[PDB]
Amino acid sequence: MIKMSPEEIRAKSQSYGQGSDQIRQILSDLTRAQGEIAANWEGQAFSRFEEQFQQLSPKVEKFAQLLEEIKQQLNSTADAVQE
Amino acid sequence: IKMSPEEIRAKSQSYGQGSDQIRQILSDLTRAQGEIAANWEGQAFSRFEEQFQQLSPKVEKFAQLLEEIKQQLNSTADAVQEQD
Numbered sequence: 001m002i003k004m005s006p007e008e009i010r011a012k013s014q015s016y017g018q019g020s021d022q023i024r025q026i027l028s029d030l031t032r033a034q035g036e037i038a039a040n041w042e043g044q045a046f047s048r049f050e051e052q053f054q055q056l057s058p059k060v061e062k063f064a065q066l067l068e069e070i071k072q073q074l075n076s077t078a079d080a081v082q083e
Numbered sequence: 084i085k086m087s088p089e090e091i092r093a094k095s096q097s098y099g100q101g102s103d104q105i106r107q108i109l110s111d112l113t114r115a116q117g118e119i120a121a122n123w124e125g126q127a128f129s130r131f132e133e134q135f136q137q138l139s140p141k142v143e144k145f146a147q148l149l150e151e152i153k154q155q156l157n158s159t160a161d162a163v164q165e166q167d
């Protein structure tokens with residue numbers, strides 16, 4: 001099926017899992033920062049950036065979730081290849 | 084803005100660092116996707132490739148947005164610091 005060694009598959013899996021975790025943490029931190037900025041900057045100057053952040057955030061979340069699913073699949077596949 | 088220039092710049096740094104980290108993850112994982120896809124015959128990985136490709140441009144746009152916010156914040160901090 002897959003022509004890659006278990007050892008390399010597991011290294012890839014760590015990259016996907018670590019990427020997922022880091023993207024979730026960045027989105028959490030910057031979501032907090034957006035809130036603090038938006039609340040302390042009255043009026044409209046930052047509004048275009050807020051609108052784009054809100055539109056893109058759910059996609060970034062979706063991407064982190066995908067990465068976690070790829071991690072799980074690669075773990076499974078490494079097991080099967082090795083066994 | 085009701086925030087000190089120093090705090091505005093601390094936040095700016097976080098947006099920049101986040102952007103850099105996301106672009107690094109995206110570059111690394113795009114290379115992984117290609118290698119895994121190339122070495123997996125049949126349809127098993129196809130759905131993950133499809134979903135990755137659908138979302139990656141939006142993640143790239145998000146990284147770009149964070150750099151734009153970083154520079155907007157820097158410029159705003161400069162203006163606050165100049166306002167007597």
Ligand SMILES: C[As](C)(=O)[O-]
Nearest residue numbers: 096099100102103
């Ligand atoms: C190199 As940077 C942390 O200013 O985007």
Ligand SMILES: [Zn+2]
Nearest residue numbers: 004008118119
């Ligand atoms: Zn390799």
Ligand SMILES: [Zn+2]
Nearest residue numbers: 017018020021
């Ligand atoms: Zn994790």
Ligand SMILES: [Zn+2]
Nearest residue numbers: 036037086090
């Ligand atoms: Zn604060």
Ligand SMILES: [Zn+2]
Nearest residue numbers: 041042043084
């Ligand atoms: Zn006012």
Ligand SMILES: [Zn+2]
Nearest residue numbers: 099100102103
């Ligand atoms: Zn940067």
